[PDB]
Amino acid sequence: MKRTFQPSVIKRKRTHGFRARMATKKGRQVLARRRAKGRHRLTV
Amino acid sequence: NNARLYQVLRGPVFSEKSQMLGDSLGVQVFKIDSKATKLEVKKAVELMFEGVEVLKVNTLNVKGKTKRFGKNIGRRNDYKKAYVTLKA
Amino acid sequence: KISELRDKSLEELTQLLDEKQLDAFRIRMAKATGQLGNTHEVRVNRRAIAQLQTLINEKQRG
Amino acid sequence: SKLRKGDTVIVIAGKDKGKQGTVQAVKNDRIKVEGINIVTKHQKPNQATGVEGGILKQEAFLHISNVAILNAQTQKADRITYQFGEDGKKQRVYRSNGEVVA
Amino acid sequence: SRVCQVTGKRPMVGNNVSHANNKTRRRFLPNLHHHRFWVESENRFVRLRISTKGMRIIDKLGIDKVLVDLRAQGQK
RNA sequence: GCUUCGGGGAGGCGGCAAUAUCCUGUGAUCCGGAGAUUUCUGAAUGGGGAAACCCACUUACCAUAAGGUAGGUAUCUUGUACAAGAAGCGAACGAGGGGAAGUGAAACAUCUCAGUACCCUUAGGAAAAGACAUCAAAUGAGAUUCCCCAAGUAGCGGCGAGCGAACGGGGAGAAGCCGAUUAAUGCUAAUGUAGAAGAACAGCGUGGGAAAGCUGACCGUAGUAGGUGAUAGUCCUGUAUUCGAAACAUUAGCGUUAACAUAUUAAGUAGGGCGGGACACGAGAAAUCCUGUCUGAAGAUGGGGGGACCAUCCUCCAAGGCUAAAUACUCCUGACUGACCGAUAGUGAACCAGUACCGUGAGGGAAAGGCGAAAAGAACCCCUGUGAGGGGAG
RNA sequence: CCACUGUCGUUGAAAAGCCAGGGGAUGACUUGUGGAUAGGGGUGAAAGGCUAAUCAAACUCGGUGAUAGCUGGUUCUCCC
RNA sequence: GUGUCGUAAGGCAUGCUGGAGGUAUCACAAGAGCGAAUGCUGACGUGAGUAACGAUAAUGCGAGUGAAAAGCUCGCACGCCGGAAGAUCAAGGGUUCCAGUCCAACGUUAAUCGGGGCUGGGUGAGUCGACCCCUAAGGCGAGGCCGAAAGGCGUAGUCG
RNA sequence: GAAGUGGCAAAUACCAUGCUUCCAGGAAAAGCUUCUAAGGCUAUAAACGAAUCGUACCCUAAACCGA
């Protein structure tokens, strides 16, 4: 049957992408928190 | 300028496609800069192989392959190559 | 090597750098086509180009 | 660093204790002196290169502290010291006697 | 925002206290009003969002005295 | 990786990780100071955008073709369409604006948790506070902050659960002013960032190997350091000790320059009503402080406080602004330490770890160290598929 | 596009399917792409349905080592 | 492992293995003693060489290569799909595409074969698509309005 | 070294964004053609150019979403 993920690149970069994170105060807090953990992947 | 055209051509391509094209249509296949346009390639070949006139340039970006080695996953540089046609 | 480059005029340093850039292409082609036995000219040529562009910046600034 | 390439040394520790030789190569803390501390190497043959192979006997590195400079006069192991020459030259000097040579 | 320009009056926080002494967070808002103040020194009506305490300050100090202090403070 | 200034003196072209071409006393590699270069994204700032991309305009120069080189072009704030700033990121500590609930009360609503978690704004090496409109009531004291007591006292409290002072004493540090500001520059002094020298052991026996055994020496302002083929003051690197700086930060003293600031004694203020908040203090007999609303003085022949309130007495002058130290903290730099761990421990992470892996995402989150002293990592032969694996040899 | 009946499957080929039949099939239809509504909120031709295999209050992190008059467990030896 | 000693926890001695550390005595301090917590991590059992090997479209034989062939290559024949199980894309993926070479692991068996390992090659546009111009829904949004702060909304526009 | 032209049948594709009907009344903006406001254009040709990114391969699937 139809599963849950169903990928779309434009939809992925537009709801979780770098510029989507940087366009809100809380999205920049997400990025700061990924950087403090040292994650090699900030944004999808 | 004339100090950027020396960095357009990175090296000729030696393969079965490049060797078969030369013998039949006399088109040179080169590995070119990752930023070289068709105009720069045209101006680099005729400056640097004196006596030849380029008809056309066909360029393409080809992506490097992921060649794992040891315990690591690593990929080869992507690169740009050009087919250049010379006047018969 | 740098001794006989420090007393060259700006006009002839730019003119000398041009051969070194053109020489860089010839090494690149010769190396790829298997005509470069001594594979240490490429390194010294790159350093020489770096040396020339360092001097050019100096004689253009001071 | 107190022992260079070429100087005659005597090995004062190990299986070759008491033997002499000239230093062939100095690494950070290991020394290779020709003639002593030779090992049996089973060299695997290869056609790509020119080296043949076989059972080869080659001198190996040993710790730099197991060898000492050999005094040229007393023919015995001595240490090395430096002398700040007023002329502006620094030379290694035998600890025991104290002459400039080596 | 909902602040007075001349007095600095802004909302205060406090408690709603019931007879059983139950406490809930509330706010106290300033008595802010929009008034067009006549300014003889400029032959013009300047319209300010002011509290009723501010009006008494113009009544006692004058609009000219208040207006320069507003300009000195910033927003004009 | 380029240049220069210093150090250093024989090897070197980072690691896995070797090989090749080579470099190096015409001083390499390497270490320290300064400089130059510094693609694109990102505050990202020429416009846009699905970050590492797309599209531009403009000035000057060059080229003649379909371009090049060097710039300029975001927004806001402060000054005369022109200059100077700001932006964003990053530990904890500070100040400030908002502010829970789990829980406890053996239920639960007042209360507690707790002004905590969290959210938000913003600074400095600290911040805040700070010189009396303060206490005290003794023979008076004399700013602020922090520590030990006072004291789990006095109080507050469905007077329950709990909350919980102050006066004053002993200390640390002390300072009071009306610019105790900020930023540059130049001298003077001291550090810091590479370094250099640095003593003194032999013989014999065992042993793969000596540092351990036996005998006898030596240095010590250097004897409990790390290594070295087993346990070394005398083998190495070191240690005690004595010292170097061309260059550039840093700290302090003097001088100069330019930015800002420089109150003159304080009215919508003190006080009051109403509703709240803070005080240890839950309206209580509730002083004192804060203020959303409504009001509102006296103004030195005066006013605030001394815990309802009045009188007397004492004390002090709000409605101007500042002020070092003692105090809080650790992303960090150095030196040193540990009756701290030793690979299921200690950081999640000793290892290519915030990785693999899981998740749309926020986010969650592993496993995994050790040949040997030295690769001397087993030439060659044999079985097998020129495989795996083994047996010889070494 | 659905999902009415049955068998099968139930450590499945499948964390909802297959097979044999079944319903709608020009419409209040089905479907691609992009966008909007966010947690006591949303959306719901209404089943407390659905809101990422999670729903009478999502998920992640934090308060947090919530509390647990409850259940389980509680590690050497001998003497009184 | 063995012997021996003590009421016990346990001590001592010693053979082999091991190859670089250990620690009397007396004090002192504890991450101080494990069989259970449907405890936690790793390893390994039993079930058991059992179920199963994933659509019942289907295979047979001859050569080749190979250490080895039911499965690979070639050939003849047979069977299945054929509004697909054939072709072109978009989405998504990212080298899986082609050749040579290898068969440890992966492939639910074998494998000489492979979407597996390794080494090379391969994607050529004025006309196809993107980019570009334009706009929809919907975003962001000089100034503007509103709001303790954070921010919410919104015009011209600017994206989409 | 060959042929390569006649009949018939015939799409859901094209004419057709047409036509006829009905109500539930059917995007926007630009490219393009014309008009002027403040203040070069049209024909003829000749030469030269049209950048950059994608392009392999699967895609009713063993390559995507389902470990």
Closest CA to D5 of D20, D28, D24: D24
Surface-to-core class of residue D70, CB atoms within 10 Å of its CB (0-12 exposed, 13-18 middle, 19+ buried): buried
Counting Cα atoms < 13 Å in the Cβ hemisphere of D13 gives 8
Contact C40, C26 (CB under 8 A): no
Stretch (H or E) spanning A36: helix A25-37
Chain B residues whose beta carbon lies within 8 Å of the beta carbon of residue C28: 9-11
Torsions phi, psi for E52 (to 5 deg): -70, -25
Closest-lying nucleotide for A37 based on CA to C1': F354
> In chain B, whose CA is at the least distance from the CA of C33?
B12
CA of B72 to C1' of H42 (A): 27
| Maximum alpha-carbon separation in chain D | 58
Q: Which helix (H) or strand (E) holds C54?
A: helix C41-61
Which residue type sits at C18?
D
Chain C CB contacts of B1 under 8 Å are none
Neighbours of chain E (3+ CB pairs under 8 A): none
Sheet holding B54-62, edge to edge: B9-12, B27-32, B79-86, B54-62
Nearest CB among C18, C22, C33 relative to B12 is that of: C33
Report the distance separating Cα B78 and Cα B61, nearest Å.
7
Overall resolution, Å? 2.7
- Chains with ≥3 Cβ pairs under 8 A against A? none
Task: Please give the angle made by the CA atoms of D11, D40 and D59, to the nearest 5 degrees.
Answer: 35
Distance (Å) from CA A36 to C1' I53? 36
For residue D31, give the nearest of D4, D54, D70, D56 by alpha carbon: D4
For CA atoms A22, A24, A30, A35, the dihedral sign is: positive
